[PDB]
Each structure stands twice: as structure tokens, then as C-alpha cells.
Amino acid sequence: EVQLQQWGAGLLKPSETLSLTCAVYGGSFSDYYWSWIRQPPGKGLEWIGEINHSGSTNYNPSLKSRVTISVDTSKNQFSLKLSSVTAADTAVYYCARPPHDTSGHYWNYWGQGTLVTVSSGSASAPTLFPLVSCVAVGCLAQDFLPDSITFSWKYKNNSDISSTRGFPSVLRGGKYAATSQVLLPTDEHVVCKVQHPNGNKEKNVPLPV
Amino acid sequence: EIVLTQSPATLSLSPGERATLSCGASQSVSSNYLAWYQQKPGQAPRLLIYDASSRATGIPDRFSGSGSGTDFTLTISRLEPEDFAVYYCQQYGSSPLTFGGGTKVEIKRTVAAPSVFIFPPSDEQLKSGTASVVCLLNNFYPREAKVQWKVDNALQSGNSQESVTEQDSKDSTYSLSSTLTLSKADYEKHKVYACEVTHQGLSSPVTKSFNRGEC
Ligand SMILES: *[C@@H]1O[C@H](CO[C@H]2O[C@@H](C)[C@@H](O)[C@@H](O)[C@@H]2O)[C@@H](O)[C@H](O)[C@H]1NC(C)=O
Numbered sequence: 001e002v003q004l005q006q007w008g009a010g011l012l013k014p015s016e017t018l019s020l021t022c023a024v025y026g027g028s029f030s031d032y033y034w035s036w037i038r039q040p041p042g043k044g045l046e047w048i049g050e051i052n053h054s055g056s057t058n059y060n061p062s063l064k065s066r067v068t069i070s071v072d073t074s075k076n077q078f079s080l081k082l083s084s085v086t087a088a089d090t091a092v093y094y095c096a097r098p099p100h101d102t103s104g105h106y107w108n109y110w111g112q113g114t115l116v117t118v119s120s121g122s123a124s125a126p127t128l129f130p131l132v133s134c135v136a137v138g139c140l141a142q143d144f145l146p147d148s149i150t151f152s153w154k155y156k157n158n159s160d161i162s163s164t165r166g167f168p169s170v171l172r173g174g175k176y177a178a179t180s181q182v183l184l185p186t187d188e189h190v191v192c193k194v195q196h197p198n199g200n201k202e203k204n205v206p207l208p209v
Numbered sequence: 210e211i212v213l214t215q216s217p218a219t220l221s222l223s224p225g226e227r228a229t230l231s232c233g234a235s236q237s238v239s240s241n242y243l244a245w246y247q248q249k250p251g252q253a254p255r256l257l258i259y260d261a262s263s264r265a266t267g268i269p270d271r272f273s274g275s276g277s278g279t280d281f282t283l284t285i286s287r288l289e290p291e292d293f294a295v296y297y298c299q300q301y302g303s304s305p306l307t308f309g310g311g312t313k314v315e316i317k318r319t320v321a322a323p324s325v326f327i328f329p330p331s332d333e334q335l336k337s338g339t340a341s342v343v344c345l346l347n348n349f350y351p352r353e354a355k356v357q358w359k360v361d362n363a364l365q366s367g368n369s370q371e372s373v374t375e376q377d378s379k380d381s382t383y384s385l386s387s388t389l390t391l392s393k394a395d396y397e398k399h400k401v402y403a404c405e406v407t408h409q410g411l412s413s414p415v416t417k418s419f420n421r422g423e424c
Pocket residue numbers: 155157159184185186187188
């Protein structure tokens with residue numbers, strides 16, 4: 001019944017300014033209070049503020065100095081500006097709308113969310129090293145930013161491995177790391193592949209004896 | 210702001226059981242203006258109940274909500290498999306609008322002790338100047354497990370990171386990965402590297418280790 005699309009830059013540096021936009025395809029654009037909410041990874045939700053087509057706004061007081069929300073009634077879009085970010089601003093940011101003009105501010109229409117990471121680092125593709133036991137083999141992805149990595153494992157006779165297991169990424173020193181493992185019950189090796197915005201990479205992982 | 214505190218934080222039940230979750234307010238909330246949402250990994254929150262006890266369109270009537278004042282509660286009368294997830298409450302009785310910390314409803318199963326694996330740093334990795342020693346525990350339940358690192362039995366501390374998976378959808382267990390990170394200097398400088406694991410499905414801790422070199 002209503003669609004909300006979001007867009008905006010996903011990787012920033014300390015003290016730059018965050019900017020996100022949300023467009024509405026669907027009912028009337030008119031009397032609702034449209035909101036911005038956000039969610040740091042691992043933690044819960046926090047409301048930032050809201051606005052209607054005629055410009056009146058309401059902000060959460062713990063962000064009120066750094067925030068500005070505004071609307072464009074010419075394109076049915078609204079947007080959020082958050083200045084001086086620091087690493088605490090990293091989070092998934094959603095837009096949303098309440099079901100009626102005349103009621104509680106609870107939300108039944110949401111956008112899909114934009115993850116925004118704030119770091120001093122600079123985009124970079126992983127470097128890969130293998131993990132052999134001194135059966136289980138593994139792969140280490142290191143020094144990547146932002147955090148969007150994907151892993152896949154293949155046999156030497158090209159065909160997918162599926163006894164696989166992957167772990168969330170950890171954050172050490174402005175950048176990330178992540179590990180993946182395969183559990184196997186000739187061939188002299190097996191293959192570890194990762195995909196990442198800054199570059200796909202491969203590495204053969206030797207079999208132990 | 211009104212603070213909302215949800216408990217428990219984790220709920221282990223079985224498919225078919227009944228779940229009952231709490232959301233306490235630190236002030237009373239006007240007109241029962243309280244709502245509950247459901248959240249699944251990587252997805253936006255979905256509305257279940259609004260105005261403390263009305264249900265949203267399409268929501269099955271096993272969900273029900275009651276309360277008023279400063280104690281609101283959510284009841285799911287018969288856990289079905291799609292019901293396992295994270296639930297939040299939210300008040301809209303006064304600004305700023307606020308949310309509780311969420312309670313996760315996990316599947317209960319029979320305890321299972323983990324398999325442990327240890328892995329030394331690669332030569333390539335060593336050549337670049339840092340050392341990463343990796344300990345891997347697989348397929349355990351419940352979730353709580355302690356991992357302690359030992360280097361020549363000198364209990365390490367403040368230099369390891371852990372990461373946990375989501376409850377697996379085949380057998381409902383968890384897997385965890387631990388990383389000890391040293392500089393090449395430091396790695397070279399010692400000899401026995403060990404990973405020590407305690408878990409309720411184990412009668413005493415398990416230890417896995419290797420010697421620098423023989424590998
Ligand atoms: C593709 O490889 C599949 C798995 O390879 C196993 O081979 C063992 C000999 C050992 O070396 C391990 O690498 C693997 O567990 C194998 O089962 C398929 O038959 C292969 N070829 C075809 C025809 O698909």
C-alpha cells in the first residue's frame with residue numbers, strides 16, 4: 001500500500017556530515033509525521049525526530065543540537081542531516097510512517113534501512129590467509145572496510161562445498177576481520193573465495209595430514 | 210525520557226509452549242499508548258499490537274497484549290516456528306518517543322558440548338608482522354561458554370575478540386570463534402599456545418594447544 005525508498009552515502013569520516021533521503025510512492029504525502037529512527041548493531045532502536053508537509057518538526061532532545069530534518073513537497077521526499085559524526089553514529093537508519101494522521105505515533109510502514117559506518121580508515125578489500133589444523137580447514141579475511149563481505153568455498157574439481165560455517169565480523173582498529181570454516185569428512189587443496197565492494201579475492205587452502 | 214525495561218533478555222522455550230514477555234515503564238504511559246514489534250535478522254521491525262491490546266491486520270490471534278499504567282505484557286499462546294525472534298515494545302504517550310531493549314526468544318534443546326579446534330598463524334601472515342591465533346568452538350548448546358587463552362600458562366587478557374553465530378536452523382546450536390592477536394616479535398618470543406574452554410556440557414575444561422614450529 002505504500003513504498004519507501006532510501007538512499008545516501010554509507011561510509012564517512014569523523015566529523016563529516018551524514019545525509020540520507022527517503023522517497024514515498026503510494027498514498028497521500030500530506031498530513032503524516034514522517035520519522036527517522038536508527039539502530040546500532042547489537043543494540044536497540046532510537047527515535048531521532050519527525051516532520052510533516054508544512055515544516056513543523058519534533059526532535060529527540062539528545063541529538064537536537066546536531067540534527068536537521070526537512071521536506072521537499074515538490075518531489076514527495078524528506079531527509080535527514082546529522083553533523084559532526086563520530087564512530088558512535090554508525091548504525092542502520094530507517095524511515096517510517098504512522099498509519100493515520102490523527103493518532104498515536106507508532107509505525108506500520110518502514111523503509112529497508114541504510115547501514116552508515118563512520119570510520120577513520122578508508123575503503124579497502126580484504127587480504128586473505130589460510131587456516132590449516134596443526135577434518136577442519138579455514139580462511140581469514142582481514143583489513144576490510146566497509147563491512148560487506150561474502151564467502152564461498154569450492155573443490156579443486158570445480159563444484160560447491162556446502163559443509164560451511166561463517167561468523168560475524170569483528171571490529172579492530174577502524175577496520176574489520178572475519179573467519180569462515182569448512183568441515184570435510186585425491187585433491188591437494190580447496191578454494192576460498194570472498195566478494196567485497198572494493199575487490200573479489202581468491203586463496204587456495206591446503207589439506208592437512 | 211520514559212525508560213522502558215524488558216525482561217527477561219533471553220527466553221528459551223519449545224515449539225508449542227507459551228511465551229509471556231514484560232515491558233516495564235519508569236513512568237505511567239498515557240492512554241495505554243504502547244506498541245510491540247517483531248524483528249528478524251537483517252529486516253525492518255514489523256508492527257504487531259498498537260494501543261496496548263489491539264492487533265494489526267494480518268496478525269494471527271495467538272498474539273495478544275494487555276497492560277496499562279507502567280506494566281505492559283505480551284503473550285504468545287503457542288510458540289510456532291516462525292515466532293522465534295526479537296521483540297521490542299515502544300511508548301508514544303509522551304515525547305520523546307522511546308523503545309525498550311528487546312527480549313530474544315530462542316529455541317530450547319538438549320545440551321550439547323562443543324568441538325574445539327586450534328589454528329596457528331600462517332607464514333604469510335607472519336611475514337607481514339602480526340600474528341593471529343584462532344580458536345574455534347562448534348555446535349554447542351546452550352550458548353554460554355568461556356574461552357581463556359594461555360601462552361606458557363600465563364593467563365592472557367585484553368587481547369582477544371570473540372564472535373558468535375545465530376542459532377543454527379538445522380539443529381539449533383551455536384558456533385563461536387575466538388582470536389588471539391600478537392605481534393610477530395611477541396609470538397616468536399614464547400612457546401606453548403593454548404585455548405581453554407569451559408561449557409556446562411563438559412565435566413571439566415578442555416584444552417587444545419600447539420608448540421611454535423612443530424605444525
Ligand atoms: C568433486 O570433488 C568431490 C569431493 O572431493 C572429495 O575428494 C576426496 C578424494 C578428497 O580429496 C576431498 O578433496 C573431497 O572430499 C567429489 O566427491 C566429486 O565426486 C568430485 N568430482 C565429481 C565428478 O563431481
